[PDB]
Amino acid sequence: QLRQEAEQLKNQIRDARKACADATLSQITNNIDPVGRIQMRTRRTLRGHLAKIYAMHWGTDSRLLVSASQDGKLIIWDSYTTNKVHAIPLRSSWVMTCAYAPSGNYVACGGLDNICSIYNLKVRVSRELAGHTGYLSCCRFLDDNQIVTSSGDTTCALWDIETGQQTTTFTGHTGDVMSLSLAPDTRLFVSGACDASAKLWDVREGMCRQTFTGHESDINAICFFPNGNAFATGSDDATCRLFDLRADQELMTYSHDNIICGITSVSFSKSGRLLLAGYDDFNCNVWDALKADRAGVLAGHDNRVSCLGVTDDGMAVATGSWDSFLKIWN
Amino acid sequence: RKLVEQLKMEANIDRIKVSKAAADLMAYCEAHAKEDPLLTPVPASENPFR
Amino acid sequence: QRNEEKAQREANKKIEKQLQKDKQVYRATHRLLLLGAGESGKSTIVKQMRIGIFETKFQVDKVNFHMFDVGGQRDERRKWIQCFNDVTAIIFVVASSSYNMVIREDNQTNRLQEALNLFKSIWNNRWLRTISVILFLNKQDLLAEKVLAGKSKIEDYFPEFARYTTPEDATPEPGEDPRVTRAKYFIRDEFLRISTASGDGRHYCYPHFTCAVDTENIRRVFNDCRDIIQRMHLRQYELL
Amino acid sequence: EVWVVGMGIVMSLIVLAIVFGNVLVITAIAKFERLQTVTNYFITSLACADLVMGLAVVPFGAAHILTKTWTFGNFWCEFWTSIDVLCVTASIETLCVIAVDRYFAITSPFKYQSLLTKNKARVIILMVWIVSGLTSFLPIQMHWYRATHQEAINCYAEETCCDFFTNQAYAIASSIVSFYVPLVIMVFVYSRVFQEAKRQLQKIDKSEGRHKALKTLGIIMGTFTLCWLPFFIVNIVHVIQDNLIRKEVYILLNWIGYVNSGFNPLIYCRSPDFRIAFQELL
Numbered sequence: 001q002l003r004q005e006a007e008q009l010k011n012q013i014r015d016a017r018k019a020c021a022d023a024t025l026s027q028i029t030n031n032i033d034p035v036g037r038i039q040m041r042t043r044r045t046l047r048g049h050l051a052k053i054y055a056m057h058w059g060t061d062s063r064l065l066v067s068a069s070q071d072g073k074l075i076i077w078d079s080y081t082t083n084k085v086h087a088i089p090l091r092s093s094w095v096m097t098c099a100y101a102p103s104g105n106y107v108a109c110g111g112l113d114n115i116c117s118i119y120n121l122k123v124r125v126s127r128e129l130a131g132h133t134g135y136l137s138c139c140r141f142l143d144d145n146q147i148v149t150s151s152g153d154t155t156c157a158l159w160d161i162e163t164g165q166q167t168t169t170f171t172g173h174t175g176d177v178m179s180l181s182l183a184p185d186t187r188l189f190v191s192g193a194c195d196a197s198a199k200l201w202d203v204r205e206g207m208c209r210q211t212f213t214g215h216e217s218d219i220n221a222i223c224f225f226p227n228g229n230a231f232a233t234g235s236d237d238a239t240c241r242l243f244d245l246r247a248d249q250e251l252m253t254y255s256h257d258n259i260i261c262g263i264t265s266v267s268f269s270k271s272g273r274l275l276l277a278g279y280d281d282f283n284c285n286v287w288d289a290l291k292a293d294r295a296g297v298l299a300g301h302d303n304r305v306s307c308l309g310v311t312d313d314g315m316a317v318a319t320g321s322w323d324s325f326l327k328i329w330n
Numbered sequence: 331r332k333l334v335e336q337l338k339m340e341a342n343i344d345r346i347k348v349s350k351a352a353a354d355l356m357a358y359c360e361a362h363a364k365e366d367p368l369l370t371p372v373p374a375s376e377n378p379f380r
Numbered sequence: 381q382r383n384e385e386k387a388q389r390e391a392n393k394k395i396e397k398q399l400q401k402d403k404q405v406y407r408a409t410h411r412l413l414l415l416g417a418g419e420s421g422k423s424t425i426v427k428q429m430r431i432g433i434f435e436t437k438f439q440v441d442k443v444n445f446h447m448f449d450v451g452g453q454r455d456e457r458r459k460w461i462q463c464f465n466d467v468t469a470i471i472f473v474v475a476s477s478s479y480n481m482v483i484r485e486d487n488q489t490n491r492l493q494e495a496l497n498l499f500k501s502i503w504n505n506r507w508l509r510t511i512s513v514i515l516f517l518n519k520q521d522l523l524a525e526k527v528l529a530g531k532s533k534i535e536d537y538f539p540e541f542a543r544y545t546t547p548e549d550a551t552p553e554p555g556e557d558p559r560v561t562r563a564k565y566f567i568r569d570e571f572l573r574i575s576t577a578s579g580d581g582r583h584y585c586y587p588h589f590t591c592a593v594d595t596e597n598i599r600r601v602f603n604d605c606r607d608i609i610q611r612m613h614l615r616q617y618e619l620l
Numbered sequence: 621e622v623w624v625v626g627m628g629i630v631m632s633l634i635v636l637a638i639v640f641g642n643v644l645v646i647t648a649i650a651k652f653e654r655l656q657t658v659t660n661y662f663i664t665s666l667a668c669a670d671l672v673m674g675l676a677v678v679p680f681g682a683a684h685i686l687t688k689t690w691t692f693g694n695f696w697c698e699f700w701t702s703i704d705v706l707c708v709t710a711s712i713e714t715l716c717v718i719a720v721d722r723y724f725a726i727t728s729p730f731k732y733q734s735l736l737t738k739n740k741a742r743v744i745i746l747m748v749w750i751v752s753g754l755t756s757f758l759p760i761q762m763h764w765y766r767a768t769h770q771e772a773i774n775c776y777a778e779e780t781c782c783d784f785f786t787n788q789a790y791a792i793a794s795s796i797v798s799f800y801v802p803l804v805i806m807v808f809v810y811s812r813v814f815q816e817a818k819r820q821l822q823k824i825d826k827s828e829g830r831h832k833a834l835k836t837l838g839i840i841m842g843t844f845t846l847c848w849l850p851f852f853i854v855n856i857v858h859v860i861q862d863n864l865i866r867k868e869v870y871i872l873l874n875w876i877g878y879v880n881s882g883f884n885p886l887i888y889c890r891s892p893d894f895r896i897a898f899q900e901l902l
């Protein structure tokens with residue numbers, strides 16, 4: 001009975017979104033000069049992983065990074081000197097994500113075991129977080145005391161380290177969520193599921209204010225614009241899209257006729273001009289956010305890339321691939 | 331169920347025209363473009379890696 | 381000063397040695413994935429092989445084998461199936477006696493047909509393009525008791541069985557009726573038809589008939605893994 | 621004149637082909653980190669030996685053949701002979717080692733990962749290079765190989781002309797260390813590998829009712845045998861009976877053995893990854 005009302009309200013919201021748009025981003029930004037071709041060289045090549053890497057997270061100082069591999073080792077690296085500060089074995093051989101706390105004291109880790117493991121650097125496991133039906137997919141730290149984990153149970157949850165019990169749970173995703181990204185002020189929060197919909201959550205209220213379903217296939221990556229008023233979602237439809245929270249709709253789509261492979265990880269530059277996206281075609285393509293025209297190609301990886309993180313300083317870009325090699329670019 | 335209530339809550343949100351948001355993003359990119367080592371190739375002396 | 385650099389170099393050396401030993405250990409061990417239907421009977425095979433993720437370590441002929449099984453994640457689309465890309469073989473367990481019964485509450489969508497569709501999805505996967513499948517057909521004696529009874533006819537559920545004939549170059553059991561042999565070989569050929577179409581020398585399907593009290597599953601998996609690695613190495617050198 | 625320039629053109633083309641193929645192979649393994657494989661270490665060693673051959677002995681041998689005299693010093697002639705023996709022994713023994721590694725990888729798949737590591741490959745390469753260097757330099761530089769008849773004494777005394785004269789014992793030892801024993805090992809391991817491949821093909825045919833190995837082993841064995849075996853059989857013969865084998869046929873078979881090294885990159889680097897690396901480099 002309520003399905004008709006829901007459809008009518010969805011049509012109304014679509015009409016409102018259409019009426020709220022006058023000129024696309026391309027129309028307003030075609031006047032400014034293009035960024036031009038970009039040359040990026042592998043300054044540091046970090047070797048040591050036994051198996052493929054899935055994710056990594058740069059430290060706050062933009063110097064140290066933590067990388068997770070299916071061998072079960074959560075290796076911490078010093079990008080400047082290419083030295084392994086720590087090597088943390090994992091209880092679960094399969095790992096799907098990792099995190100680096102802003103303070104740098106704690107490092108998170110979770111995989112197919114449905115348990116979020118948190119390690120204390122200054123190395124033994126501090127707290128193991130349980131309560132997720134499906135496999136964990138991404139974890140990030142709001143601060144040294146809280147962490148948000150999104151699992152295959154189609155639910156994103158906010159945990160507390162001291163208590164070990166989730167403070168709140170976010171529901172409303174048809175498919176399992178695959179990625180998330182915290183806001184710069186940590187007030188807001190987004191996650192991209194497999195139902196081609198990316199939802200903006202709220203760590204305080206716990207209700208998704210907005211949902212964007214411009215994609216055609218499952219979403220594999222997501223990341224805020226540095227301003228915090230926009231985010232980019234990378235799906236398997238070979239397209240990267242830049243949504244806008246204030247406009248509640250898509251702005252630009254990044255695609256080419258040559259590429260027919262999905263996107264694994266998406267990250268912005270410090271100023272947000274460059275939208276770096278890691279592809280399934282063994283290379284990473286960098287885009288112009290205001291132009292949608294690809295500038296450079298990072299084809300140094302032998303196998304598929306699985307992660308991509310730009311430093312907080314905006315100095316280097318690190319891409320970890322399936323060939324057990326994590327390369328630093330600049 | 332609760333889906334209709336959630337979508338009704340989603341619908342009643344104030345929105346701004348896409349022109350304003352696009353202009354704001356463009357202005358942010360233009361204003362903060364100076365402090366971007368990726369856009370402007372940093373000199374080897376300034377580059378910490380090499 | 382340089383003392384910090386020296387300490388960091390010492391830590392790097394220790395970590396490098398530890399990961400060298402870990403690499404030796406990891407390359408020594410082989411990985412397997414236990415995939416099957418919920419009521420297929422993987423528990424019986426797991427118990428036989430042993431004697432949110434379940435991992436059992438068993439070794440035969442001084443060769444370490446690792447078996448991974450996940451059952452919490454049950455969805456039409458699986459993202460964890462792309463994670464198992466370095467496994468030597470994917471063990472598939474199918475209930476060969478579940479042809480006449482349906483669990484989806486819909487007509488003609490038999491559990492055997494669902495298992496066949498799952499096998500097709502696993503085989504025709506971009507990431508699983510070099511992973512062989514060791515197929516186990518559990519509960520062969522239940523299938524025998526069903527076929528020797530007139531309760532269910534396969535032709536009513538599987539139309540191709542009406543015109544199907546037993547292979548001349550087959551290997552019937554020492555004590556088995558012609559009817560049960562025809563049924564089991566048709567069920568095996570149903571999977572083998574999907575197996576032959578897609579893969580081209582990259583990976584193969586190994587079908588085995590297993591009862592509820594079979595104890596040779598450990599040796600069968602060992603032989604199948606040996607053949608898989610031999611075929612992979614032979615193709616890498618462009619011989620086979 | 622016309623005969624000399626044609627032969628000079630042929631030897632120049634052979635030198636160019638050998639050097640180009642070898643530098644391409646070492647560039648392919650060295651430049652790309654995805655080609656760094658345990659077996660690829662042995663392939664790199666083989667390509668390095670072939671490159672040293674084609675850079676050192678083939679050009680000087682061509683100069684000796686065309687000019688009909690040895691302008692350089694007698695000590696340099698001894699060094700050139702030693703380098704040639706080193707290159708030949710290293711190349712053939714590395715081919716044997718690659719065949720052995722394939723045999724272990726196929727016959728014993730479970731133990732192959734543990735049996736061969738980077739350290740084991742490095743120590744095997746060092747051992748083969750040391751044994752080749754021994755067999756080359758130790759008998760030659762210490763003059764163990766020199767003959768006793770007056771023809772050899774006159775040949776070694778004159779600095780202008782520097783031909784090859786070997787003792788029967790040294791010829792037998794050099795042949796049995798360079799070619800014959802590696803030939804036996806390669807034939808045995810490749811027969812076992814062919815038997816295993818036939819067994820696997822029979823198993824596949826039996827399980828799945830609904831030639832390539834023979835061709836690959838045929839090319840691998842036939843190229844090496846046709847390239848080297850005639851030279852080593854005449855190497856044995858002319859020391860067994862001097863009157864049977866002339867110098868021209870001996871030099872011709874030796875140069876066939878030389879040009880063998882050109883085909884090794886075209887045979888042992890036909891993998892799709894190697895083709896992709898070649899396309900990227902070129």
Ligand SMILES: CN[C@@H]1CCc2c(ccc(O)c2O)[C@H]1O
Nearest residue numbers: 701704705708784794795798874
């Ligand atoms: C100068 N020609 C040398 C003479 C003897 C000799 C060769 C190659 C391999 C051997 O084991 C040898 O004993 C020839 O290349």
